[PDB]
Amino acid sequence: MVTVEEEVYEFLKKKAKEEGTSVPAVIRKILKEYFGIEDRTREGSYIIVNGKKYYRINCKLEKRNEILVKLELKKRGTTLNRFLKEMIMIT
């Protein structure tokens, strides 16, 4: 499971529609491309905190890739949300 800000979710939802796929498919594609990994794995609810929505996404990867991704985000010193946010901003 991932948690993202609304701006990030909007962005992911648009790519999910633009391409004929779900929001988790888009997250999996970004993770495969930016972490350079193979994954065999193959709508959106939220919570409100100080008036802001935060979407909880059921991203499921192979257990081994879940660990690599967590580790790489840690080594890199970034949350997944901030990583996706910076990638957006580079457009």
Side-chain angles (χ1 to χ4, degrees):
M1 203 231 59
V2 186
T3 313
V4 301
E5 290 171 25
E6 187 169 17
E7 187 174 6
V8 170
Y9 184 75
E10 300 312 323
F11 169 84
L12 290 172
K13 199 158 64 76
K14 288 157 184 172
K15 296 217 86 149
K17 277 165 188 177
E18 267 180 358
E19 324 198 339
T21 39
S22 61
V23 170
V26 173
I27 289 163
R28 278 199 296 282
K29 187 151 163 266
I30 291 160
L31 301 182
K32 285 149 132 190
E33 292 185 338
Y34 287 71
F35 297 90
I37 53 182
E38 178 89 317
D39 190 280
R40 199 96 164 272
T41 285
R42 178 56 163 152
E43 201 227 54
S45 74
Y46 57 66
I47 68 176
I48 302 159
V49 196
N50 294 317
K52 289 146 200 149
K53 292 207 196 149
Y54 294 93
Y55 292 78
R56 290 214 176 286
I57 294 172
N58 248 0
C59 194
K60 301 195 181 176
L61 284 170
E62 297 175 9
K63 287 174 178 220
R64 268 63 222 172
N65 288 150
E66 211 181 279
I67 290 156
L68 294 178
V69 165
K70 284 185 220 271
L71 182 67
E72 284 298 331
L73 298 162
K74 260 226 163 322
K75 296 181 158 181
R76 181 66 193 179
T78 193
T79 53
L80 180 46
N81 176 78
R82 189 183 115 219
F83 172 90
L84 297 164
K85 200 165 59 182
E86 292 184 9
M87 196 200 82
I88 300 328
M89 279 264 53
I90 297 168
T91 293

